[PDB]
């Protein structure tokens, strides 16, 4: 249970200035689109792969914004075990910041007892 070093879960998401302004506080506006995925996470081989595509155009995800999403530049995360942590391995980008994930990437998820697990985590992009 304390031993499980597990990504549980391969999603994506893109933020972007909506170009609205609070209405209290005036700051610059964050829209989150979440993008929509499907995973196969095979433990036993030590990958977890996703498969996501952009949802349509609408609200402030506008068609113009909507294009600026690519795989090279994608934000990707991951949910892993209770009490796990997980660490790129030198040159895997970091998960919520945009990277080229036109490649696959390595992470070391570290269980709560301080063992670990290398994962191998492979996306692809539908528009």
Known sequence: AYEEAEITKVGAYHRFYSGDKDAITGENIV???ELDRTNNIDSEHGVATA????PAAGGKFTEAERAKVS????????N???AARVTPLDGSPKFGVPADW?????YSVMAADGTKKIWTVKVTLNK
Not at 71 to 78: A, G, K, R, T
């Open 31 to 33: 829209a989150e689109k």
């Open 102 to 106: 036109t490649r696959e990437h390595k």
């Open 80 to 82: 892993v075990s209770t």
């Open 51 to 54: 498969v996501f595509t952009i």
């Open 71 to 78: 795989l090279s530049n994608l934000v990707v995360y991951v």
